[PDB]
């Protein structure tokens, strides 16, 4: 067979230990799910430094905690805007997930609170910026560089799926690089508890699995499809399916055809053909062997999964960091004010936040 006795015994024991870890992680998650934390700071505890990100989701600001001096990224949401855009459930669910999970590649929520106008999530500051910026700057990542990042996503999805959480928001725009060069996943607005199927149309055109496009009841295998898109884009510098307009992208996705740059290794192409598999009965991550079909694939043969989890692998790239509070890896924005109001807004809808 492909493995001798010693290698097969070692892999079997490793896979059993992952099961043991995940069972304990699930018990810990469910306890925190039932008893969420609440109102653990207030706005005057922080200095506002600079806007890090702005959009329909509200804004994220670099702040400094007055007492301790530590920097954080504070996501601010306007309650009245959340209501207008029909996002109450997604907002409450994102905060509930973040306060309940624990994994080295998932961003940590340190504080949350609200006031008359806004909701606040105070998260660890991840100073390296978005993978998107680095990928467009360098052009494409070499296969070892891409593999280092992909391994972290595989482990993170293995963790989330063991909690019965579907992720659905994977793309380079939504991955941050930390000071040690490792990945941080931050956005949980599309995440959902899904033990069987779910049906919502959500995501980004280039990263949509065919079964979402085709309006099916789908399952957590859409995340493994999206991992295929991510690995492809990291290694090529462009994604496998693109076009002027989303409709043409969807036509390519569902076609069952994908083409590769001539510099992709044969191992990489084989892995991608099994992730970008339109047939769910054949897609890696959705088979009897689960995540092990991915972890044991030849493209990952050099990957030490425990060492990645323990953050003991030297990262291929370390982002420039000229000290704490450095924001050079983020974009520049116009600093709109944080206006509070004398009248509470939307107290009923956000009572559990």
């Amino acid at each position: 067979g492909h493995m001798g006795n010693a290698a097969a015994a070692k892999k079997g024991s490793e896979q059993e230990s992952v099961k043991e870890f995940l069972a304990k992680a699930k018990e810990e998650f469910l306890k925190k799910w039932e008893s969420p934390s609440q109102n653990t700071a207030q706005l005057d505890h922080f200095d506002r430094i600079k806007t890090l990100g702005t959009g329909s989701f509200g804004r994220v600001m670099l702040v400094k905690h007055k007492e301790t001096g530590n920097h954080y990224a504070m996501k601010i949401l306007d309650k009245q805007k959340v209501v207008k855009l029909k996002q109450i459930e997604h907002t409450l669910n994102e905060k509930r997930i973040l306060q309940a999970v624990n994994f080295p590649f998932l961003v940590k929520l340190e504080f949350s609170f609200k006031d008359n106008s806004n909701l606040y999530m105070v998260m660890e500051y991840v100073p390296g910026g978005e993978m998107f910026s680095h990928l467009r700057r360098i052009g494409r990542f070499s296969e070892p560089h891409a593999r280092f990042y992909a391994a972290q996503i595989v482990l993170t999805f293995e963790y989330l799926h063991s909690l019965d959480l579907i992720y659905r928001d994977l793309k380079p725009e939504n991955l941050l690089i930390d000071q040690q060069g490792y990945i941080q996943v931050t956005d949980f607005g599309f995440a959902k508890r899904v033990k069987g199927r779910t049906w919502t149309l959500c995501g980004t055109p280039e990263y949509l699995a065919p079964e979402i496009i085709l309006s099916k009841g789908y399952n957590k295998a859409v995340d493994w499809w999206a991992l295929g898109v991510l690995i492809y884009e990291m290694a090529a510098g462009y994604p496998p399916f693109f076009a002027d307009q989303p409709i043409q992208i969807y036509e390519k996705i569902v076609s069952g055809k994908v083409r590769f740059p001539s510099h992709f290794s044969s191992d990489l192409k084989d892995l991608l053909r099994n992730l970008l598999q339109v047939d769910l009965t054949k897609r890696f991550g959705n088979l009897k062997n689960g995540v092990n079909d991915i972890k044991n694939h030849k493209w990952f043969a050099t990957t030490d999964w425990i060492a990645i989890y323990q953050r003991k692998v030297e990262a291929p790239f370390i982002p420039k960091f000229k000290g704490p509070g450095d924001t050079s890896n983020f974009d520049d924005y116009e600093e709109e004010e944080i206006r509070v109001s004398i009248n509470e807004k939307c107290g009923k809808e956000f009572t559990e936040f």
Binding site: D169, L201, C202, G237, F242, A243, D244, P246, P261
Partner: peptide
Amino acid sequence: TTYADFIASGRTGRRDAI
């Protein structure tokens, strides 16, 4: 090239969700 076609698509900056 395929890369040229990518640039020409225009979908080469940050991409919004649907």
